[PDB]
Design a protein around this ligand. Structure first.
Ligand SMILES: CC(C)(C#N)c1cccc(C(=O)Nc2ccc(F)c(C(=O)c3c[nH]c4ncc(Cl)cc34)c2F)c1
Ligand SMILES: CC(C)(C#N)c1cccc(C(=O)Nc2ccc(F)c(C(=O)c3c[nH]c4ncc(Cl)cc34)c2F)c1
Lengths: 275, 259
């Protein structure tokens, strides 16, 4: 295969992070790359299948707003090679750094994120974990959507042990995803809900549910339909179109949420109005 | 699969002519560029050129190479890529005469060498590298393409190429020479031979080895290692020029030394 990179070519440099996703390094290969390695010793069946699936998903993508897949290696380690992203995630900017973006820039971040997601859905790819920490602000001018924490081990059990491991994603999980009444409750429409929460973050500067003190309460109440983000907390310069669009993306009945083509078109119209 | 069904792309403003056909800005999950052949039936030559271009572009996944996104065959042959925002390096250096700091000039050289190293690793010869084919996307990321008239090549032609030595005088080393001329443009802010008035004189004298770029025009803060590298890339004899892995390594090292 054309995207396999022979052993010896990549210089694997600094370790950036390790976790349930494997280990990510900065590397050199015709310039800067990121290298995600999924095993150290002989890979398990699970690891091999996770690697094959991730390469298969990524190889379907060629879009400016989706992390650029570049290649893979299989020996001595399973490795997925992509572009290097330079900067911080949207989550890090908004919630860890007190970055103060101008509204035109908040809308551009929304617009680029919507382009990437519209593209994914056109390629029949449900992201499954859209959230502001997976929206990379590369060189502070380009959004790159990735899945920067994809767990290699998948649980077999549709259960409440899942919520610990997915604690970093609870705020972006649609109500039907929380309730898990289907064995795989993820859809294009659950990605749209997550995008609604991102809109909330951009237009309020805050995470939803900031006054709820524990995750179990969020899980219970969002599941029951008794907790919803406080939309009144949008900043005074929030455009009217964004108030409407955010409420539509957060609709409790999944089939009432708008599609990404419609979301994108609305945000493109807004951006034109502000320019 | 990369075929884009008809009707999905909104074809917008006409930008210019391409290497074949016509380039437009378009909409397709965001901005794109679309190069279309606006004929009702393509010739064998046109179909082959389309196939060769899609085939080459599909082999590329690198931040410094224009991103291929898809193609269409009906009703017209079309090649779809990312839209590049900004201007070419030619435009910045020679038209706007944008005043870049030396750190940025070196970064542009470094990014161009990454893209070219990548191409040559993928067994792709560019054949028309020049500053008009180096797009400065968002004023800071190099995208190498072959933009034709959307953004004229004798100044970048190695002596063996300009003298028409044989029916196909191109090689990785003629790409290296073209890169040497891009280095010259970056480091001097000028085109080579800016004082020579006649194209035929340039063709004759560069081919013979009696005219070469005036390296005295390099800016006083051009690092010595960059000037020497440029001179190596510009060697009149093809086989004396360095490979891109060596070029890239040298630029990476000299850039590290500056900062
Ligand atoms: C298409 C989709 C649904 C999206 N969207 C998806 C599905 C599955 C996985 C990924 C996915 O993105 N993989 C992946 C693979 C290799 C990596 F190195 C990294 C990775 O951490 C980085 C890749 N550059 C980086 N620069 C800087 C930093 Cl700090 C980290 C990285 C990575 F996240 C994306
Ligand atoms: C891989 C290689 C050897 C390199 N390197 C190569 C070989 C052959 C052709 C091309 C090649 O680049 N094709 C191509 C196809 C479609 C286009 F729309 C355009 C195109 O003008 C643009 C694509 N975005 C653009 N943003 C802005 C503007 Cl002003 C123009 C464009 C284009 F140049 C590249």
């Amino acid at each position: 295969d054309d995207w396999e990179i022979p052993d010896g070519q990549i210089t694997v440099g600094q370790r950036i992070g390790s976790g349930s996703f494997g280990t990510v390094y900065k590397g050199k290969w015709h310039g800067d790359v990121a290298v995600k390695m999924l095993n150290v010793t002989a890979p398990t069946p699970q690891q091999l299948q996770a690697f094959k699936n991730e390469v298969g998903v990524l190889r379907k993508t060629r879009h400016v707003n989706i992390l650029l897949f570049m290649g893979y290696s299989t020996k001595p380690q399973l490795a997925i090679v992509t572009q290097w992203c330079e900067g911080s995630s949207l989550y890090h900017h908004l919630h860890a750094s007190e970055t103060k973006f101008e509204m035109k820039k908040l809308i551009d971040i929304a617009r680029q994120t919507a382009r990437g997601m519209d593209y994914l859905h056109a390629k029949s790819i449900i992201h499954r974990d859209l959230k502001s920490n997976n929206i990379f602000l590369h060189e502070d001018n380009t959004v790159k959507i990735g899945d920067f924490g994809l767990a290699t081990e998948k649980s077999r059990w549709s259960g409440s042990h899942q919520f610990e491991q997915l604690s970093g994603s609870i705020l972006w999980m649609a109500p039907e995803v929380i309730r898990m009444q289907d064995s795989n409750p993820y859809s294009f429409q659950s990605d749209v809900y997550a995008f609604g929460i991102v809109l909330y973050e951009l237009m309020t500067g805050q995470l939803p549910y900031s006054n709820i003190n524990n995750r179990d309460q969020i899980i219970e109440m969002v599941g029951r339909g008794s907790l919803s983000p406080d939309l009144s907390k949008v900043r005074s310069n929030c455009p009217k179109r964004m108030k409407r669009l955010m409420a539509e993306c957060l609709k409790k009945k999944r089939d009432e949420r708008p599609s990404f083509p419609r979301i994108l078109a609305e945000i493109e119209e807004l951006a034109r109005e502000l320019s």
